[PDB]
From a paper:
AiV-1 virions released their RNA rather abruptly at 53°C. Electron microscopy of AiV-1 virions heated to 53°C for 10 min identified 95% of empty capsids, which were used to reconstruct the empty particle to a resolution of 4.2 Å. The AiV-1 empty capsid is expanded by 7.6 Å in diameter relative to the native virus. In the native AiV-1 virion, the interpentamer contacts are mediated by strand β2 of VP0, which interacts with β-strand F of VP3. However, in the empty particle residues 112 to 139, which form the β1 and β2 strands of VP0, are disordered. As a consequence, the interpentamer interface is reduced from 2,750 to 1,400 Å2. The N-terminal arm of AiV-1 VP1 undergoes structural reorganization upon the formation of the empty particle.
Unlike most picornaviruses, kobuvirus capsids are composed of only three types of subunits: VP0, VP1, and VP3. The polyprotein is cotranslationally and posttranslationally cleaved into leader protein (L-protein), viral capsid proteins VP0, VP3, and VP1, and nonstructural proteins that control the replication of AiV-1 in the infected cell.
Numbering used by the authors:
A (entry chain a), D (entry chain a): 31 to 235
B (entry chain b), F (entry chain b): 12 to 60, 67 to 75, 140 to 370
C (entry chain c), E (entry chain c): 1 to 223
G (entry chain c), H (entry chain c): 1 to 56
The structure:
């Protein structure tokens, strides 16, 4: 038998990381990212890029307690629309290791695994996505001591060590006279979360 | 319960992934044939056990001295070539460096000698790592990046010979330090093995939570030496030569040296390094670090 | 066709809700072999079991008997801000229970002798003021010249089954279990030309019955 | 056999308290609570706070007939939106015993078990939630003779003796020139309702 | 995909409707042991079974035979506003049935003697005016010097199976069952220097067949 | 039917909580090992019958005289320490107070003497409860808060000794009152045991619905004494010392004292208190109430 | 989640359509005994079988 | 009737998502026999197995 008292969950990394948490936007670890309606944006799904980036409570701070991780990414995007007309967002999945186009066009993004999200007027619309572990590495490292390329130009990075890149293109049926920018918010969760080589927790006040 | 989320569970055949309803997609384990490597200590690499038709065909330290982690299980390798092993000439205990430990050093002071490197994570490493500006600094060195420090210390060893001749390597590491003090001496050093040393990781190793990393304490109250060993780690089954340091050694001070009066204000330390179970794949021309 | 009706809360995103995701990758992925990587962690309590320094308590030959060297309450104001790995796991969650393992490492000389009494007193409106008043609880008189480290167990002599991790109300009935303090039992002695002081490194980690539940925002807004 | 006449229900506290009833808002036991769109509000799920508060028929008055209660809370919120633009409400669950943030932000509330409710324009939107018995006490007391803390500052209260606190943050995609306030209405029901130590019913006219 | 169609009443909140809630807590909760707490109540009728004072009827030696000491109709105008625990349970619901247990506690002296006749008359357009007219119904002549309390059962001699609890229409055919009244049968007597008066405490509670159904807004807007 | 709602029912494994549909979440009973306590009378506390791998490891009154509630079942305690019991020196019938009962007192008049406390719920209690301003008031006292009144009455008893030395306690309570009147006296008192006495609870105990609480009536027509006993109650298995009064005694008047002419206009009453089955956990320094 | 699509005629009320009602009463009702009442009719043709004057 | 609730991402078109199409042809079609046509390819790797000049 057990008896048992079956040790409550919440202690298990498979359960703890299944819940959604606000992803810090690349750069300063900002809670939101603003991009124009003309070109769109490309948001990398790379841990190292998320932990630029020593935060405090940010999900990044929790992931920085492990050296290597391997899980199936769950991502929820929010597109805040400022103007008074409805729009449509084209979200395409570039696999980790794929060539990212310089000018994202509707035709080229259609060759990847894409989704066409209707966005409502004067409000934000939410949509959830599921991506399996597609990285060519055995485990995605959060920290890396070395160079990405043999020439040694990029230090402490592995572009392929990620779930890939998400390419966004806004679409409008009406023509606006003033160019406006969308606001983007991201949530991330993990399925079948596996972690290797623990690291010390980040400091606090 | 089974929390309110869905970790997997998974599906198949048309259960958790049909044209009527969906749950989160999950990746399966890739069952590959090949030579058994990756995990050091347990190498024993041997043979393993096109599939489509063509259109044109018909508590803790300094208690004992054991491995910081237990050795893991081997995995099938992607490359078909047979490895080259240095054997006892390579896998041996080498005198890595001799360094001084003075009482002026305070809590969390990383100690390193001539063969060591100044690495707090903030130093701009000029490629390749063999550049002299990386090892010679205005201040005292702090770390011993493996195998970079080991290969630099002994560039003529059989281990370094294959290291400069093969694109990838695979081995564990064992570090030992001997510090002899009389019964009247007091103080404690910590032997840290830091995986993928970066700016934040090295500074947290100096702090209170650093004991999450592999560690053994060299307390002068009882010990004169302390040993620590770690198995192989990396994002790939074999590490690229000259471009990746999986482990880095840190000998820092927990309790500042407290020598008896009228005696020297510093004790000498001897740092040893031991590569454990070494294999090298992909033989080609000589490209040093 | 089926007939349907929407309940209140349509289009609402939940962190704890399952089955919201739609597939953004068509093909079945196969992750490369990762059994060669050691030190695989699966639980947050394993971090708590690792040692973690909390206080560097000094001890000199000039210290007389009944001298307090350190004291801390067993409440989220202290146990959640020591800097040890266990303190980080506690701050992540809202409730804790079970025993806490304290380890006092004597980093003095092999010629030093003496005793330090480590006392654990359960919850009370006022902390213990003197050594003998603190020795009325669960204590252990520790002779430093034996094994290097002292294994002091902090028992979970608690009012309820769980203790709350609220930094704003640490002295609550359902929050603190009491105080743990270090007093000088027998003065530090040793031969002449030996060090006149000896540091004692206080570590803290989780006992074998230590648990935590109900996750909260980390970092905390504290103060 | 029975025969039977199986004594009609409605007499059983498990059945009687499963139905929803309007929760009195903390303060005066008001039927609604007004909060600005700038910061939001925090509504405690504490019986003692609900029975400030000797009412007449209020669900509080019914709960005051029992000393200790233990059940799984069901709560339905209503957010009345006065202005002409749609909005989104962020409702996060702070467990009983958790540290409640001073300034509720989107990032910090995302670490709790939260929900993102779309609110319609010029009307009220309703959403229902289910929270299990998460209190660290054996049974949540409706009345308490003592002090919460050892210092004896708060008399007759137990903050942990509750289902926790619900933290609200309004979100707007458009920018309004005049700051407006939301109106909040709450309904509460109970699953697996258990009660101990009966108390005399409240007086009436 | 399934085809669907919404019936009238989309997005409507119902107090009696199940399956509206969405999970606002992710993890499975475990409530602490509560078997040590006694007096666990599970039914509203258990409150009704507890005693409850309704009228403090005085009785002096000056009171002659055929003197009325009290009278109340068995209708939601009285039975729902006595202040007893049963009256609160009745006011919560819209219909009631079954027997009502009355208990007249004699709190006089041990030297007092006499008789008080307790009469229950079924429903009629006019209440009983005299003692003998009230004694034409179900009554019991109670000698006060025996046991302290009188166990008077109010039988459910009713027209229908259920009686409505409507305070606006108490004298309805489907509301009231009749009147219960206390008359002086034999005058209160006792030795000299004994108390000239004796109080009788009238309690009311639910019988073993008492039931209630169809919940209504409590408090009531009454008057 | 099975009302139209859903009480639980519950679910598991993926029945009432899957990624396709949801019902209301419910909490399960926590099965814990430990010492059997909480429920008084039935103490008999004895032993009971880590579970995860680490990364570094390989009708009514005054009829008879019985308990107001039946005694409940024991539960496993969270604390591992063995309790200290006062035994017969503690668990005994003590003379709590002697108070007068005059005829001037009307319906619902709470009677208490020198050892009693004025507590209608509106009094501002200055912490700690042992402050003299709590017990001395401008008007007459009304209640007997347990154990506050019992410990104050006998501060040198073995029960109070452990009470001031342990952080938590657990026991039932039995209160008895003797009022001797001749056969010519009339009147009735009610012995109330009020759980968690607060402003609204104490005022409803004076009123008609107060008989929901534990009660026995001391009617001078037949009785000279009346006894009432209650088992232990609290939100926790053990009550915090000096900071919580689970039970409070109230001796109030149902029928005003009606004495015979030419006799005294008041009768004397003697209130007794009996702690039933006492255990004390968490021994430390002396902290009085 | 299930995928769905609405056919033409959403939100339409039909006198002959079943399963439109939502519960406006929570508890299970019990009707009082009514077997004492005679002359229970169940069919419209029973009215037609009763006599009826048409022309004098 | 069933009760339902829409998850985020309603009306979104996915290249990898199945079961989006509705029938735009009523009758069951029968394709003419095509077993006479040789050189049937089924895999992209078969192209890769064919020779291809890279440098002269």
């Amino acid at each position: 038998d057990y008896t048992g008292n079956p040790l409550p969950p919440d202690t298990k990394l498979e359960n703890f990381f299944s819940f959604y948490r606000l992803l810090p936007m690349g750069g300063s670890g900002a809670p939101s990212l603003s991009f124009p309606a003309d070109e769109g944006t490309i948001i990398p799904l790379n841990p190292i890029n998320w932990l630029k980036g020593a935060d405090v409570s940010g999900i990044a701070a929790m992931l920085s307690c492990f050296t290597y991780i391997a899980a199936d990414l769950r991502i929820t995007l929010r597109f805040s629309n400022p103007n008074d007309n409805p729009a449509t967002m084209l979200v395409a999945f570039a696999p980790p290791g794929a060539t990212i186009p310089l000018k994202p066009t509707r035709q080229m993004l259609s060759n990847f695994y894409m989704a066409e999200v209707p966005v409502s007027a004067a409000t934000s619309t939410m949509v959830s996505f599921s991506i399996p572990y597609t990285s060519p590495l055995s485990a995605i490292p959060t920290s890396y001591f070395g160079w990405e390329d043999w020439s040694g130009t990029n230090f402490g990075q592995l572009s392929s060590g990620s779930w890939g890149n998400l390419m966004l293109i806004p679409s409008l049926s009406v023509d606006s006279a003033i160019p406006f920018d969308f606001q983007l918010s991201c949530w991330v969760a993990f399925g079948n979360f596996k972690a290797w080589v623990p690291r010390p927790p980040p400091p606090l006040p | 319960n089974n929390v309110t989320t869905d970790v997997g569970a998974n599906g198949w055949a048309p259960t958790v992934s049909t044209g009527l309803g969906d749950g989160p997609v999950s990746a399966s384990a890739d069952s590959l044939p090949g030579r058994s490597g990756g995990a050091s200590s347990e190498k024993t690499h041997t043979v393993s056990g096109s599939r489509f038709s063509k259109w044109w065909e018909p508590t803790g330290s300094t208690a004992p001295s054991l491995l910081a982690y237990p050795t893991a299980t081997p995995v099938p390798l992607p490359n078909p070539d047979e490895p080259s092993q240095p054997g006892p000439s390579g896998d041996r205990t080498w005198l890595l460096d001799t360094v001084t430990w003075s009482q002026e050093f305070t809590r969390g002071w990383n100690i390193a000698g001539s063969n060591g490197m100044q690495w707090t994570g903030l130093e701009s490493l000029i490629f390749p790592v063999s550049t002299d500006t990386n090892w010679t600094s205005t201040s005292s060195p702090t770390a011993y990046p493996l195998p970079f420090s080991f290969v630099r210390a002994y560039p003529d060893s059989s281990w370094a010979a294959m290291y400069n001749t093969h694109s990838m390597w695979n081995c564990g590491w064992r570090v030992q330090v001997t510090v002899n003090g009389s019964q009247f001496h007091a103080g404690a050093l910590i032997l840290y093995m830091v995986p993928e040393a970066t700016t934040h990781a090295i500074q947290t190793a100096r702090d209170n939570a650093g004991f999450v990393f592999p560690y053994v304490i060299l307390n002068l109250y009882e010990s004169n030496t302390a040993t620590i060993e770690v198995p192989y780690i990396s994002p790939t089954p074999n590490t690229s030569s000259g471009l990746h340091a999986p482990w880095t050694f840190y000998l820092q001070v927990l309790s500042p040296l407290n020598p008896p009066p009228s005696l020297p204000t510093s004790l000498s330390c001897s740092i040893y390094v031991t590569p454990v179970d070494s294999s090298f794949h992909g033989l080609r021309y000589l490209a040093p670090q | 066709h089926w007939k349907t009706r929407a309940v209140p809360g349509a289009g609402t995103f939940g962190s704890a809700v399952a089955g919201q995701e739609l597939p953004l990758c068509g093909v079945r992925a196969y992750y490369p072999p990762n059994a060669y990587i050691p030190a695989q962690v699966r639980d947050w309590l394993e971090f708590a079991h690792r040692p973690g320094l909390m206080a560097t308590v000094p001890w000199t030959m000039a210290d007389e008997p009944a001298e307090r060297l350190g004291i801390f309450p067993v409440s989220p104001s202290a146990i959640a801000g020591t800097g040890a790995p266990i303190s980080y796991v506690i701050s992540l969650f809202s409730q804790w229970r079970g025993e806490l393992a304290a380890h006092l490492l004597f980093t003095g000389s092999a010629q030093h002798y003496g005793r330090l009494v480590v006392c654990y007193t359960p919850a009370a409106p006022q902390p213990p003021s003197t050594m003998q008043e603190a020795m009325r609880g669960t204590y252990t008189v520790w002779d430093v010249n034996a094994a290097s480290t002292l294994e002091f167990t902090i028992p979970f002599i608690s009012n309820s089954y769980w203790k709350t991790v609220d930094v704003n109300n640490p002295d609550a009935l359902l929050s603190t279990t009491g105080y743990v303090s270090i007093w000088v039992q027998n003065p530090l002695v040793g031969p002449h030309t030996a060090p006149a002081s000896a540091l004692v490194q206080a570590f803290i980690s989780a006992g074998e019955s230590f648990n935590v539940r109900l996750m909260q925002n980390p970092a905390l807004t504290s103060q």
